[PDB]
Design a protein around this nucleic acid. Structure first.
Ligand SMILES: [Mn+2]
Ligand SMILES: [Mn+2]
Ligand SMILES: [Zn+2]
Ligand SMILES: [Zn+2]
Ligand SMILES: [Zn+2]
Ligand SMILES: [Zn+2]
Lengths: 162, 162
DNA sequence: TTGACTCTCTTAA
DNA sequence: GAGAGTCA
DNA sequence: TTGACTCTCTTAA
DNA sequence: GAGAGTCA
């Protein structure tokens, strides 16, 4: 199996290639009416993507390296966490974008957590609006807000109490 | 069926049958350190469930009525909203539990909204913890909290800026 | 060893 | 969160 | 007409 | 949010 040193070499190669990706400025809500700025290192929209990178789905990519004539492949966003536990509380760990920008591969924009924690950041009020995430959000979630509920609770008779 | 009066009669029949379901008291967090009480009308765990009701999945049921010698069937929680639009902003409308208790069919615990709004209620701080839902939550979401993130944003080198 | 494609899968509302 | 089919 | 089962599907992380 | 196959 790959040694820790070999894993670090994979991570170092990933960082060097991704650091050459275009760095794009995005102005984002932070919560409480405050705005901030994030810098995403964005993979190209079409091939070529960069040494070792290939698109396996509309917004899914993989990283590949050959070591001692054996081919190894990882999800493109999982590489910063190859030295971390792969599960927590009986749930699998996922790469999670604090920036909600799939093409972005900035490791300063990624955390390693459960799919429920990952999903939940979509509705978080944000670092300046009341975020309670132990690993703090970088922005207000894209889906925070009043929502668009079509109909609320209602009864025709009087069989029910709340 | 097709007539408003037929639709009203279905809702009246559904309300009468659900009104006989056992009423279960649940003590729930509301946000802000406050606790409250909800009264859920719970479908039985096994057959028989009630006139017109049948189980199609572990926590899935359907309501069925014969009208004009024709069988009409709906998802068991959708019946209160049969007169509402079936989509919103190009998104399908779903029945959404404010009590987060699938077995509960109390119409005072249900709303009609997109699936994103539905899911997002899982993380809401609650009616006394800062809920901004236009149609207000009845309790804090079951997944609100700091989370259990295994690893946060990090870099081995010095190529990236947040 | 490498690139650019192909396919199917998981979870919990 | 959904819809539809097979029996009795 | 009614009941009790069966199977597969949708969406967006 | 994932892993794996094919071909040159
Ligand atoms: Mn995410
Ligand atoms: Mn729900
Ligand atoms: Zn980013
Ligand atoms: Zn947060
Ligand atoms: Zn309820
Ligand atoms: Zn709410």
């Amino acid at each position: 199996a790959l040694t820790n040193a070999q894993i670090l070499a994979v991570i170092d190669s990933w960082e060097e290639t991704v650091g050459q990706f275009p760095v794009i400025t995005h102005h984002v809500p932070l919560g409480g009416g405050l705005q901030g700025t994030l810098h995403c290192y964005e993979i190209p929209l079409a091939a070529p993507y960069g040494v070792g990178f290939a698109k396996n789905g509309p917004t899914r990519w993989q990283y590949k390296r050959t070591i001692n004539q054996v081919v190894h492949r990882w999800g493109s966003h999982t590489v910063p966490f190859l030295l971390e536990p792969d599960n927590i509380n009986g749930k699998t760990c996922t790469a999670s974008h604090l920036c909600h920008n799939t093409r972005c591969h900035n490791p300063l924009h990624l955390c390693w957590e459960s799919l429920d924690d990952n999903k939940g950041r979509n509705w978080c009020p944000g670092p300046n609006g009341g975020c309670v995430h132990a690993v703090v959000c970088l922005r207000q979630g894209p889906l925070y807000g009043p929502g668009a509920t079509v109909a609320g609770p209602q009864q025709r008779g009087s069989h029910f109490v709340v």
